[PDB]
Structure 1
Amino acid sequence: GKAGDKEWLPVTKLGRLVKDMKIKSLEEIYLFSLPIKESEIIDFFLGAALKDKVLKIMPVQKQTQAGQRTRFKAFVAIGDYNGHVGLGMKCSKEVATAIRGAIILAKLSIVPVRRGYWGNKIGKPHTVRCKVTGRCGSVLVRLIPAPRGTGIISAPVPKKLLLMAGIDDCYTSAGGCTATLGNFAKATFDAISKTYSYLTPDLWKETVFTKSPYQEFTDHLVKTHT
């Protein structure tokens, strides 16, 4: 009948360079450690490999002189099976609105993972590079590397995240109250972050400090653009 979308007019500088398609991958963005402030940038590069896995839909409620008032707080995971995962929390008066608020927030907070090998090479990394940890308020995880074909040996909660990450082999162990899973999953996600923030002898050679996209593509942005 009537056709054509028009969606996503950027109000963000970084968003405009993507929309004009002078930034060709997310990998450039992460290398300059920029914020991402829009949820359509990620959904432009990807959007046909991102799945969601709604973990829990948890009530909370406070007390007032007229009685209870309940809001629903849901956690929603996100990730494609090539190395990018994310996670988000949001709460709202009702259910569906809170879920849809979290599916947006999880895309925003998406990060890459670094995968590595066991003790020898045959191509295609299958496991975690080094033995790392991640803590969120008395919960911690100890992601330990593992040989091929052992599968992910973990509890149900981190087994979601690590499987979406493409980390197919891992040994784990938990410590502390894992019953309150909001800590447990955020502590897993904390660990998965540290993989590119862990220094290894590979990375000891010095970087060349290539010029920023902000600098090079500034010529199009001298019109009125911000």
Structure 2
Amino acid sequence: GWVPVTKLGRLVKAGKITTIEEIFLHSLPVKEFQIIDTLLPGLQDEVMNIKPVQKQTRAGQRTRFKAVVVVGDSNGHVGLGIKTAKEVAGAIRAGIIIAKLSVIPIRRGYWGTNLGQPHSLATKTTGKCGSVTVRLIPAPRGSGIVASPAVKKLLQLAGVEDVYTQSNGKTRTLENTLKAAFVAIGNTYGFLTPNLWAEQPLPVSPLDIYSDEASAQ
């Protein structure tokens, strides 16, 4: 059974919100993974990397396992989750869920002509995490993803078809690199081009339109 806690989990199960684009429209904070499961079911995951960490303790060494995970369709919705437990599978389980929660949108655009269905980026973008800076650059069709196996895979599941990449930093530390690539494609819907200069009336929040149809008991 589901039994949602939170206003948002109720509205979503109760068929009153149909797509996350709304959630992102109003920047609704998401707490329940089942939300992004029903709202976007073609989500397929992918374990990116697994590594042992180790803690020294007042009565034992502690080597648990860190797992990095990417979820996405291939249609403008990515999620990057990082989790460390003491069994591998438990790290992967919890990782997939975290990655579902963080599922963000991708604005993709055209390399430079109007044609049929966006295939690249709106602008260049940059993401930093720790020492690594992943920089994303719009590319012409059939350029492909010009990126390392990991970052490529995050960019495919994200929905991108052709892009250029450049990286700076100790890129061998996978955790930081993917996080930077994540932040890089996360930045695409923060960048103001003139095609988005037009004034919008300012939509009303689902949390208020189905006010009643949410609500605790």
TM over 0.5: yes
CA distance in 2 between partners of 1:211 and 1:69 (Å): 50
Q: What is the deviation of 1:221?
A: 3.9
Q: What is the deviation of 1:163?
A: 0.9
Helix, strand or coil at the partner of 2:83: strand
CA distance in 1 between partners of 2:53 and 2:124 (Å): 36
Query: Does 2:47 correspond to 1:26?
Result: no
Q: What is the deviation of 1:62?
A: 1.5
Query: Does 2:150 correspond to 1:138?
Result: no
**2:133–2:168 CA contact under 8 A, matched in 1:** yes
For each residue in 1:20-40, what CA deviation from the matched residue of structure 2 results, as whole angstroms up to 9, or x when unmatched? 111121111110011011000
Helix, strand or coil at the partner of 1:199: coil
Q: Which runs of structure 2 are paired with 1:76-225 in the superposition (5 Å)? A: 76-221=69-214, 225=216
For each residue in 1:169-210, what CA deviation from the matched residue of structure 2 results, as whole angstroms up to 9, or x when unmatched? 011111110011100000000001000100000111111012
Q: Which residue of 2 aligns with 1:13?
A: 7
Query: Does 2:37 correspond to 1:35?
Result: no
Q: What is the deviation of 1:67?
A: 4.3
Q: What is the deviation of 1:81?
A: 1.0
Code of the residue aligned with 2:119 in structure 1: it is H
Segments of 5+ residues of structure 2 without an aligned counterpart are: none
Code of the residue aligned with 1:89 in structure 2: it is I
RMSD over equivalenced CA pairs, Å:
1.2
Q: What is the deviation of 1:41?
A: 0.8
> Which of 56, 66, 69 is the matching residue for 1:63?
56
Q: What is the deviation of 1:50?
A: 1.4
Q: What is the deviation of 1:219?
A: 2.5
Give the stretch that moved more between structures: 71-80 or 212-221. 212-221
Helix, strand or coil at the partner of 2:161: coil
Helix, strand or coil at the partner of 1:143: strand
Q: What is the deviation of 1:65?
A: 4.8
CA distance in 1 between partners of 2:183 and 2:96 (Å): 19
The 4+ residue runs of structure 1 with deviation greater than 4 A are: none
Q: Among the aligned pairs, what percent are the same residue?
A: 59
Helix, strand or coil at the partner of 2:51: strand
TM-score for both structures, normalised by structure 1: 0.92
CA distance in 2 between partners of 1:162 and 1:221 (Å): 36
Instruction: Tell which has more relative contact order, 1 or 2 (C-alpha 8 A, sep 6+).
Output: 2
Code of the residue aligned with 1:108 in structure 2: it is L
